[PDB]
Design a protein around this nucleic acid. Structure first.
Lengths: 80, 116, 60, 207, 53, 126, 11, 153, 82
RNA sequence: ACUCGUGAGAGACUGCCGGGGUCAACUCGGAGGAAGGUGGGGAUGACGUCAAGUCAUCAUGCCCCUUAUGUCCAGGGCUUCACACAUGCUACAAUGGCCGGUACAAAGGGCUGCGAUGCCGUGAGGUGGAGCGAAUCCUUUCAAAGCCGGUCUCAGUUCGGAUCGGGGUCUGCAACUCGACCCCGUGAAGUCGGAGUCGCUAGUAAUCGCAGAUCAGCAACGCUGCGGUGAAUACGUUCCCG
């Protein structure tokens, strides 16, 4: 059995990828098993000069889906 | 008891009483007490004269304390001063010698605050 | 920053202790992010413009 | 600073990202070549109003989709402009890069294009008030456009004192998340300096 | 010219403009004097506002 | 069998109840080796006390997250849920006791510009 | 002697 | 509190004595959130008092509270643009809070080498009417009496 | 201080300078810019013109000052008092 | 099966009851419910004000330099100190110090990086490389406060750690000016701090630890997050500020 790992920055894209992946492989599938979302957080200062007390927060969220059996540029595929 | 010319405190645990020696802290006291064998939890008023002798000979053998250590430190500082190194003139004018900031702090080397 | 320093940043020397980040688009030496290679101001502006695929505002 | 950029406020709800690719080790160089492509396409084409630039990357292959109101100007009848953009896009270490030149359906409901036109008129000799009036009245004719605000700041009319002016028509609720606000900012180059133009346009709301 | 004083916890600040240092300092002194006069809060300055009759 | 869960500010307790004697098995440790505090034991046994049903149920528990206080609170909530599952009709006595309500008192998120969630940097007007 | 300290330190 | 009074926290009864007052006391002596240490201190003090006197902790604790509980206090009130020290009647909750706070604070300044021993000695003296908290209550009642003339507003 | 494994750090320039200086047993004034170079027992007789920031200060090495660096004996900042 | 992970959905809408209310807004109480009245916290900052800050993120009108105010390099400086102000950390100790045992988190990071077992050092650390692009491996299985036991006995102390002497490790071409850490010794002021002044209404203040960015190394006690234990008080707008 080979692992199909989908990582995507967009949620709906990852559901779409998992869904047509299972559709085309249906082979016995385990289903799009979700994996914990990975969050990267950064805090920056709004003003170019001074004004440190004013901060803005950004994040990048990575959704992970797992396919165990027996594409849009947003989502990757790792086959192992 | 009189140990190397130092009067030990009246009632102290042995290693911490030995800490009162100028050349001994706590780690030194603990390791020397382990080496010679006398108990560490036993008080100063329970010392036998043979115990005083064994600590005396051990300390005089493999340790340097009190006047010799003081004069060696003083000589080292003076020699560091007289060679003209950075730490030399740092010692001469009573300023911190390990790169500490002096804009605001360093009252320890400057002494008590003076006003002008 | 100055053009000369920006160009000098790209040279590979025999000694790597000197390499500075110097964010790519404007050469700002301070506050450079390794993941994007951009300074805080440029990172914020491009994130707001949506040019970074995944970065967005925070709320929690 | 008072109002944040509307596109970034609704980036995760209404609007979509202008670059679409995934990268973990190669995020930095992808960003580098992305901004290089953007600046190259901005400097190369200025006659036809460039509405938008998307970049998609899958391994070697890059798809750059560029929107303009005059596709014929930026494209070659024999492919001369296409050949030029292709050659200058290979040189950006884009490996195999292919371009999709596209045309906007309505070139007056686009905030960026409206700001483009307002700046172009304001640059040479046109009084600013005429520019905002014409832009606003032309925007209202479009069916889906339901609100518009146009604001310019700087040394308007070559004066010694900076000023800010703004004209609104309809509804522009910048605080409402579901309502989409097309936002366009552009700097007009006058002999007395730089004049900033911002345009917000409201065309219904999405849920 | 800007001046800030901490009169027993009360912050009194003033700011003036002038063509030179001397004029600015003099105007700042006058402004600070007026502010301190309005700040007094001692009895002589708070006796006409206390309810009477 | 019957199984329930209790949650208290990042502490999770999975509880299994049987009609055995009053023996507590918290991840293989008793009510003494685990939770060595009388107040925590009161907090645990309060639903049993108000329901009169002490020393007639053997409890097994899986604990994860939080500290002793949060774990004790989650365990009490889980015990209350197990009791209401076993016997419904005593819901008033438990509900008026408040043991059936989850406590949404979580750690408030830290904010930028402040040392803590609400503590502000010292400001000198001079 | 300092020189001896150099020799023992580095050699 | 500009828009009205705030709700009160219903603190729970104690496990080993079953009274509200001891829980209030442990909350008063609490420091840095070390509730276990505060409970240990209070329980040890109660046991020490029990061993010394031979009776139940709670009754002598209540006697000490009633001995150090105030009924009249003095507050600075501004009427007609002028401030006076007006004697004011104390609500029962405030009296209990003040008595417990005085007990804890004065026991913290004793010289009995340990918090448990200091607290036990202070509570015993307050029960017998010799504690410094009793003196503080006497002084505050005296100050309330001395300014009775300002009681009309 | 520098680790013992790496050995003392002496710059090559003044190194070859002092080997060519001591090969004929004559000690002329050697002018150098490398303050970071330590002092080797091969410098015992030589006198260095160590850079300061404005000029070069002459420093005559002795047996006592071995193991230090040249920059110790070229004070940079000049402070006389207020 | 129970958690958990992440998709969809339900669930709070004064929905219902009683009473005030112009039978109006709205308000008080009650039932139900996990949650009751914008549930808790965020993102979001109207017209404008202060010619607020930024020609040193960037761009830019005008003026100026142009064998230099451009550009390359070595060394030094930004770290200087008779003082003043501000923000923090550690303390002045027994609600504690030291030693031994022992139980519970969340979040985050990792490829020329995380780096384990083992071995060598007292200890920084050295050798070595298992496994990991990671719900898997490593950050130890993760913590400290906490609980149990022993000791110290109110002292400038077994408190406090500054300063200084000596000896080392790591990074870096290079730790003198000017890194951090480790070991031995040294053991200052400091006895809860005048006038005055600051923060905080509940998982809050207080206190304890963990992680990340920047980063070869660090001046980090700073900043941004995460959780552990967790209080007191609010009678009421007369006075102070907005």
């Amino acid at each position: 059995k080979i692992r199909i790992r989908l990582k995507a920055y967009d949620h709906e894209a990852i559901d779409a990828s998992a869904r047509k992946i299972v559709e085309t492989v249906t082979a016995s599938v385990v289903g799009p098993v979700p994996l914990p979302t990975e969050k990267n957080v950064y805090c920056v200062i709004r003003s170019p000069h001074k004004y440190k007390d004013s901060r803005e927060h950004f994040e990048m969220r990575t959704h992970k889906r797992l396919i165990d059996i027996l594409l849009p540029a947003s989502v990757d595929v790792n086959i192992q | 008891a009189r140990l190397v010319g130092v009067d030990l405190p009246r009632d102290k645990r042995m290693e911490i009483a030995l800490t009162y020696i100028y050349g001994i802290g706590r780690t030194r006291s603990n390791e020397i007490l382990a080496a010679t064998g006398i108990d560490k939890n036993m008080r100063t008023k329970d010392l036998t004269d043979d115990q005083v002798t064994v600590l005396r000979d051990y300390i005089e053998g493999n340790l340097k304390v009190e006047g010799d250590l003081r004069r060696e430190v003083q000589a080292d500082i003076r020699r560091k001063i007289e060679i003209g190194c950075y730490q030399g003139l740092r010692h001469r004018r009573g300023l911190p010698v390990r790169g500490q900031r002096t804009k605001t702090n360093a009252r320890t080397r400057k002494g008590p605050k003076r006003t002008i | 920053a100055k053009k000369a320093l920006v160009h000098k940043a790209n040279k590979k020397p025999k000694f790597a202790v000197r390499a500075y980040t110097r964010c790519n688009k404007c050469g700002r030496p301070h506050s450079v992010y390794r993941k994007f290679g951009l300074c805080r101001i440029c990172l914020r502006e491009m994130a707001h413009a949506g040019e970074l695929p995944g970065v967005q505002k925070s709320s929690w | 600073g008072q109002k944040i950029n509307p596109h970034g406020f609704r980036l995760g709800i209404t609007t979509e990202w202008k670059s679409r690719w995934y990268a973990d080790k190669q995020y930095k160089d992808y960003v580098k070549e992305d901004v290089a492509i953007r600046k190259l396409l901005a400097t190369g084409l200025e006659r036809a109003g460039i509405a938008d630039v998307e970049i998609e990357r899958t391994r070697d292959r890059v798809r750059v989709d560029i929107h303009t109101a005059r596709p014929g100007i930026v494209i070659g009848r024999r492919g001369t402009e296409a050949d030029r953009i292709r050659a200058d896009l290979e040189k950006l270490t884009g490996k195999q890069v292919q371009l999709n030149i596209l045309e906007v359906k309505n070139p007056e409901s686009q905030a960026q294009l409206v700001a483009q036109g307002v700046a172009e008129q304001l640059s040479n000799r046109v009084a600013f008030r005429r520019a905002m009036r014409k832009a606003i009245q032309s925007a209202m004719r479009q069916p889906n456009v339901k609100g518009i605000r146009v604001q310019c700041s700087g040394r308007l009319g070559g004066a010694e004192m900076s000023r800010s002016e703004f004209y609104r028509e309809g509804r522009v609720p910048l605080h409402t998340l579901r309502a989409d606000i097309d936002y366009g900012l552009y700097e007009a180059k006058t002999t007395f300096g730089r004049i900033g133009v911002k345009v917000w346009i409201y065309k219904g709301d999405i849920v | 010219a800007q001046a800030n004083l901490d009169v027993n916890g009360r912050q009194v600040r003033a700011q003036v403009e002038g063509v030179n240092a001397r004029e600015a300092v003099d105007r700042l002194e006058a402004r600070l004097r007026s502010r301190l006069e309005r700040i007094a809060e001692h009895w002589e300055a708070r006796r006409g506002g206390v309810p009477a009759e | 069998p019957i199984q329930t869960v209790g949650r208290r500010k990042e502490a999770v307790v999975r509880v299994r109840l049987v009609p055995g004697t009053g023996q507590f098995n918290l991840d293989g440790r008793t009510l003494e080796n685990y939770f060595p505090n009388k107040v925590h034991q009161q907090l645990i046994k309060a639903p049993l006390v108000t329901v009169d049903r002490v020393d007639q149920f053997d409890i097994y528990a899986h604990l994860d997250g939080g500290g002793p206080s949060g774990q004790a609170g989650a365990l009490r909530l889980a015990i209350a849920r197990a009791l209401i599952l076993v016997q419904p009709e005593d819901r008033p006595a438990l509900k008026k006791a408040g043991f059936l309500t989850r406590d949404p008192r979580a750690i408030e998120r830290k904010k930028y510009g402040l040392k803590k969630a609400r503590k502000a940097p010292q400001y000198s007007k001079r | 002697g300092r020189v001896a300290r150099f020799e023992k330190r580095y050699g | 509190p500009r828009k009205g009074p705030a709700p009160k926290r219903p603190l729970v009864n104690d496990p080993v004595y079953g009274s509200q007052l001891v829980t209030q006391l442990v909350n008063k002596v609490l420091l840095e959130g070390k509730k276990s240490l505060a409970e240990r201190i209070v329980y040890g003090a109660l046991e020490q008092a029990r061993e010394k006197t031979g009776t139940d902790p709670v009754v002598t604790l209540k006697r000490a509270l009633d001995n150090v509980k105030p009924a009249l206090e003095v507050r600075s009130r501004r009427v007609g643009g002028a401030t006076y020290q007006v004697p004011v009647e104390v609500r029962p909750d405030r009296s209990t809070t003040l008595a417990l706070r005085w007990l804890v604070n004065f026991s913290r300044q004793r010289r009995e080498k340990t918090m448990v021993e200091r607290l036990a000695n202070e509570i015993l003296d307050a029960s017998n009417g010799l504690g410094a908290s009793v003196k503080r209550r006497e002084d505050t009642h005296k100050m309330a009496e001395a300014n009775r003339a300002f009681a009309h507003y | 201080p520098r680790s013992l494994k790496k050995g003392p750090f002496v710059d090559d320039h003044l190194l070859k300078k002092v080997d060519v200086q001591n090969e004929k047993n004559t000690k002329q004034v050697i002018k150098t810019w490398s303050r970071r170079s330590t002092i080797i027992p091969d410098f015992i007789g030589h006198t260095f013109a160590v850079h300061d920031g404005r000029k070069h200060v002459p420093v005559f090495v002795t047996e006592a000052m071995v193991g230090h660096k040249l920059g110790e004996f070229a004070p940079t900042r000049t402070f006389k008092g207020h």
